[PDB]
Every structure is written in structure tokens, then in C-alpha cells.
Amino acid sequence: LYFQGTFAERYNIVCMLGKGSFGEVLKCKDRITQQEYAVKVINKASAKNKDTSTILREVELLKKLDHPNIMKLFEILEDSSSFYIVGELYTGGELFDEIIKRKRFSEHDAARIIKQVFSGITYMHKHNIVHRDLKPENILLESKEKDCDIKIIDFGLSTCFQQNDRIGTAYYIAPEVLRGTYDEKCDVWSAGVILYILLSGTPPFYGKNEYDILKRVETGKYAFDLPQWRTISDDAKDLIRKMLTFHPSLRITATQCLEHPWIQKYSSETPTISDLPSLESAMTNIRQFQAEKKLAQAALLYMASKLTTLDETKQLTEIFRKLDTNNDGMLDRDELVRGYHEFMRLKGVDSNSLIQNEGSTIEDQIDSLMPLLDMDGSGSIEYSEFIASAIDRTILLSRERMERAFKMFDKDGSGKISTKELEQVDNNKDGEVDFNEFVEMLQNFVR
Ligand SMILES: Nc1ncnc2c1c(Cc1cccc3ccccc13)nn2CC1CCNCC1
Ligand SMILES: [Ca+2]
Ligand SMILES: [Ca+2]
Ligand SMILES: [Ca+2]
Ligand SMILES: [Ca+2]
Numbered sequence: 001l002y003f004q005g006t007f008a009e010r011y012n013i014v015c016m017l018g019k020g021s022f023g024e025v026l027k028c029k030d031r032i033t034q035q036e037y038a039v040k041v042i043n044k045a046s047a048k049n050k051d052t053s054t055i056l057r058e059v060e061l062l063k064k065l066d067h068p069n070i071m072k073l074f075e076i077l078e079d080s081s082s083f084y085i086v087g088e089l090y091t092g093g094e095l096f097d098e099i100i101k102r103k104r105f106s107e108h109d110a111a112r113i114i115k116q117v118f119s120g121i122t123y124m125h126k127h128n129i130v131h132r133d134l135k136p137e138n139i140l141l142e143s144k145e146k147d148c149d150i151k152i153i154d155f156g157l158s159t160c161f162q163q164n165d166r167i168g169t170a171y172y173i174a175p176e177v178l179r180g181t182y183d184e185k186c187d188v189w190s191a192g193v194i195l196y197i198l199l200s201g202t203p204p205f206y207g208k209n210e211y212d213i214l215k216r217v218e219t220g221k222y223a224f225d226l227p228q229w230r231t232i233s234d235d236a237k238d239l240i241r242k243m244l245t246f247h248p249s250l251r252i253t254a255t256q257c258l259e260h261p262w263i264q265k266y267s268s269e270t271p272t273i274s275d276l277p278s279l280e281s282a283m284t285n286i287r288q289f290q291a292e293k294k295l296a297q298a299a300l301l302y303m304a305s306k307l308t309t310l311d312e313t314k315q316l317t318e319i320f321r322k323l324d325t326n327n328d329g330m331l332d333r334d335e336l337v338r339g340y341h342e343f344m345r346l347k348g349v350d351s352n353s354l355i356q357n358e359g360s361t362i363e364d365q366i367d368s369l370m371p372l373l374d375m376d377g378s379g380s381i382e383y384s385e386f387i388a389s390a391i392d393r394t395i396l397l398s399r400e401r402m403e404r405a406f407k408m409f410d411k412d413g414s415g416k417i418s419t420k421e422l423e424q425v426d427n428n429k430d431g432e433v434d435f436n437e438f439v440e441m442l443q444n445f446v447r
Pocket of ligand 4: 410411412413414415416417418
């Protein structure tokens with residue numbers, strides 16, 4: 001293991017993507033799977049503001065964030081000079097450029113975008129994370145596909161690392177930030193500035209230079225005076241007023257943003273007849289997952305949450321969204337119950353008849369499933385738990401994906417897994433699992 005580095009053994013660097021946020025962002029490629037990722041490279045000696053143990057602890061919390069509108073981080077690796085934070089690669093660019101292209105958005109299109117921002121920030125705040133610098137430049141489009149998910153990026157590292165003059169940041173900061181305070185309410189203000197911009201195409205606190213912009217922000221004074229505001233609904237203006245309330249104690253919370261009537265009016269996404277092949281696929285797979293042993297169940301969640309790409313989960317992602325009726329990015333018990341009933345209704349099948357055919361009602365079925373699906377016991381089914389349980393068990397098992405999952409466990413690199421490193425089947429009887437027996441082990445879970 002002497003001539004093998006953690007990052008360098010696993011990943012090849014392809015090209016530079018960006019510079020600035022504590023370090024450079026590169027595209028990299030997994031040498032086994034050929035899957036592409038973004039990696040942020042942070043210099044240890046220049047940038048560290050805390051011991052490595054603190055940094056690894058806080059980055060681990062960031063890795064556990066599991067929400068469809070928050071940057072997915074897979075790992076943090078290190079060599080003698082750097083930290084390498086490896087994450088999902090998004091290819092649709094900054095929301096900022098979508099503002100430039102479109103100039104401004106209909107209420108419908110604005111609601112769909114800002115709803116995702118609200119859902120993401122809500123989840124962040126529930127996990128005691130404040131963004132601090134929320135703006136369209138730190139929100140990325142997942143891909144170039146129409147109405148793809150947005151992804152909040154570039155937060156969470158500010159206590160750990162020290163940074164090295166970017167245009168337009170002044171537009172988004174809450175007045176209390178000028179007094180040296182960043183709290184959860186400052187994220188709500190920034191989001192409201194974004195929404196003001198989506199609907200009108202112009203910042204609420206505007207000027208030709210940073211001096212004049214900050215003067216207006218300080219007063220908290222804005223108006224809906226521009227001509228374009230006369231054809232925007234009172235409901236949208238009500239939300240904005242609630243978000244750009246001067247005193248943070250009177251300003252609404254992110255959850256209140258997410259729950260606002262104007263948001264709910266433009267989030268009617270729900271299972272239709274076209275979704276039935278997709279729902280039936282998901283239900284078959286989740287039922288199999290329920291029947292599988294917890295060792296199988298745990299091992300599949302690891303594989304799905306780390307080694308799958310966007311194209312593969314895009315289908316399950318749309319279903320997830322249609323089941324997520326409160327738009328918070330996770331599925332609760334009642335959402336799964338309502339989703340099952342709706343699946344039956346759309347299919348032409350009476351749910352009262354499940355008590356004789358299968359032996360129990362939809363509610364009893366979901367209630368028995370929850371403890372098996374909610375593996376971290378969070379009270380909800382987050383995205384990766386859903387994907388783990390609903391994806392085709394076969395697609396998860398390309399040889400390349402099993403190889404990588406094997407290398408993650410074989411921590412001493414001897415060619416064979418043992419105990420602690422993660423029951424064993426063992427055909428040759430050495431008390432260890434080489435790769436070929438691992439491949440059977442995982443292909444026995446699938447059975
Ligand atoms: N995910 C991404 N995908 C593509 N390009 C990205 C990123 C990321 C974010 C990112 C990548 C990898 C690890 C991370 C760890 C902590 C926080 C953020 C991370 N930056 N950039 C480059 C572009 C340049 C143009 N301005 C917008 C960003
Ligand atoms: Ca939900
Ligand atoms: Ca959970
Ligand atoms: Ca080994
Ligand atoms: Ca063996």
C-alpha cells in the first residue's frame with residue numbers, strides 16, 4: 001500500500017471547473033467505474049483553520065445531508081498537501097445564467113424554482129446549518145434538461161477553512177449581516193431577494209456600484225414600483241414582504257416559506273395514469289427490499305447512495321417528487337399511505353380489497369415497511385433510502401460497481417475482505433471473502 005494514495009488510486013483528474021471557494025473545483029473520474037464527479041481541492045497548510053479531526057467531523061455531517069436540492073457529497077480524502085472533497089457533478093450551470101437568459105419568470109416557473117430553494121434551506125436549518133451566502137451563483141442546475149432539480153452548493157466549510165472580490169454579492173445580504181450577524185433568518189432574506197429577482201428581473205435593493213446598493217439594503221426599503229409588478233399576484237407580494245421583513249424576529253422561517261399559499265398553488269405534482277408503470281416497478285422492488293435481511297438491506301443502501309448517477313435515478317426522482325406532497329424533500333408515513341391509495345385508484349382497483357388478497361390494509365403495509373425503509377430512524381424516507389429500495393436490484397450490480405464497493409471495504413488491500421472491515425459464505429474456507437465470493441454474496445442478496 002506504500003505507492004498508492006487514497007484520492008489518486010481511486011480517481012483521475014480530467015479538467016479544471018472553477019476556482020475560489022477555499023480551493024479549486026476539478027472534474028475527476030473514478031478509475032474503475034468511469035463515473036464522473038466534481039472534487040474540491042483545499043490546501044491543508046494555507047487553508048486549515050481547525051485540526052483535521054474537527055474538519056473530518058464537520059465534513060462527515062455534510063456527507064449525511066440527503067435532500068434532492070442540496071449538493072451531494074460522497075467523500076473527503078487527503079494527502080500530505082490537500083483535502084479532496086468529492087461530490088456529484090452538476091452540468092446545468094448557475095441559476096444566475098438562467099436569470100440572464102430568461103430575464104424574468106412567470107409566477108408558475110418562479111414558484112417551481114424557489115420552492116426547491118425553500119425545501120433545501122428548510123432541510124439545512126433543521127440540521128443546524130446556515131448557508132450565509134445564498135445567491136443564484138451558489139445554486140446549480142443539475143443538468144441541461146428542462147425543469148431539472150436545482151442544487152444548493154458552497155456552504156458549510158466557513159469555520160474549518162480560511163478563504164483567500166466577486167460582483168453582485170451585495171444584492172442578497174440581509175441588513176443584519178452589515179452588523180456582523182449571520183443566522184437562519186439571513187438565508188430567508190437572501191431567498192426573498194432571489195424571488196424578487198425571478199419575478200421582476202431586477203434586484204429589490206439596486207444601484208450602479210457596491211456603495212449605493214449597501215445604502216439601500218441598510219434601510220430595508222424596497223418597493224413593488226417597477227411596471228412589471230402590477231401584473232404579479234398579491235399572494236407573491238405577500239410572500240416577498242414576509243421574507244424581506246426588516247427585523248429578523250418578525251421575518252418568516254424557511255418552513256413558512258415552503259408552506260406559503262402561493263407555493264402550494266404551483267405544486268400540484270401528483271401521480272397520474274402515465275406514472276403507473278413507474279409506480280409498479282417501484283412497488284415490486286420495495287416489496288423485495290422489505291423481505292430481504294437487514295444485512296442485505298443495509299448493503300444495498302450503501303451501494304445506491306454512493307455509486308449511482310442522475311440518468312439512472314431520474315425516473316425514481318420524478319416519482320419521489322410526486323409522492324412528496326408537502327415539498328420538503330422526504331417521504332413521511334402519510335405520504336406513502338396516500339401514494340399507495342392513489343396508485344390503486346389510478347389503476348382501477350379498490351383498496352378495501354387488499355385485506356383479503358394480500359392479508360392487510362394499505363396503512364398496515366406502510367406501517368410495517370417504515371422501520372425497514374427508514375434505516376437511520378429519521379422519521380422520514382429520504383431520497384437515498386427511497387432510491388435504494390425502489391431501484392432495479394440488477395442495475396446496481398455492474399461488475400465495475402461491485403469492484404468499487406469491494407475496494408471500499410478492503411481497507412488493507414490484501415485482495416480479501418474480513419470481519420471489522422465492514423455472515424461470510426466462504427467456498428475455500430479461509431475466513432475471508434475474496435471478490436468472487438463478494439459478487440456471489442451481493443448476487444445472493446438480490447435473490
Ligand atoms: N458540484 C459541482 N458541479 C459542477 N461544478 C461545480 C460544482 C461545484 C461545487 C462543489 C463541487 C465539489 C465539491 C464541493 C464541496 C463543497 C462545496 C461545493 C462543492 N462547484 N462547481 C464549479 C462551478 C464554477 C462556476 N460557478 C459555480 C460552481
Ligand atoms: Ca414530504
Ligand atoms: Ca430516514
Ligand atoms: Ca483485506
Ligand atoms: Ca474465501
